[PDB]
From Swiss-Prot, chains A, B:
Expressed by the venom gland. Shows cytolytic activity on many different cells by forming pore in lipid membranes. In vivo, increases heart rate or kills the animal by cardiac arrest. In addition, it binds to heparin with high affinity, interacts with Kv channel-interacting protein 1 (KCNIP1) in a calcium-independent manner, and binds to integrin alpha-V/beta-3 (ITGAV/ITGB3) with moderate affinity. This is Cytotoxin 4. The keyword Membrane applies. InterPro entries: Cytotoxin_Cobra, Snake_3FTx, Snake_toxin-like_sf, Snake_toxin_con_site, Toxin_cobra-type. It comes from Naja mossambica (Mozambique spitting cobra). It comes from the Eukaryota. It holds the Pfam family Toxin_cobra-type. Its main location: secreted. Belongs to the three-finger toxin family. Short-chain subfamily. Type IA cytotoxin sub-subfamily. GO terms for biological process: killing of cells of another organism. GO terms for molecular function: toxin activity. Disulfide bonds join C3-C21, C14-C38, C42-C53, C54-C59.
Length: 60, 60
């Protein structure tokens, strides 16, 4: 699918096995995103590094 | 992991192998939750049914 990059005015198309989109935010205040892309599996949240996944074109 | 239920005033703890929280919504106009729970993997999005996964207590 199509997934947004850090500055989401741009997006990438995903390699096979990259069936998911995701956000990577730092708890440091309020979820400032620090990574955005295509993922295979939705990553588990750390105390400060949060992941939020979706499967629709440029949703992240 | 603690995940919210359909009516979010409630939440449930998840079994093992069920490491992420998720919201299941209908695309039919406003984005409306039809399911909420604990899950294995983040489910891929259908035309009409989207899913957003997270992993922090009661993030769904």
């Amino acid at each position: 699918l199509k997934c947004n990059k850090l500055i989401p005015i741009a997006y990438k198309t995903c390699p096979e096995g990259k069936n998911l989109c995701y956000k990577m935010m730092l708890a440091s205040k309020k979820m400032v995103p620090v990574k955005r892309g295509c993922i295979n599996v939705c990553p588990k949240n750390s105390a400060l590094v949060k992941y939020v996944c979706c499967s629709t074109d440029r949703c992240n």
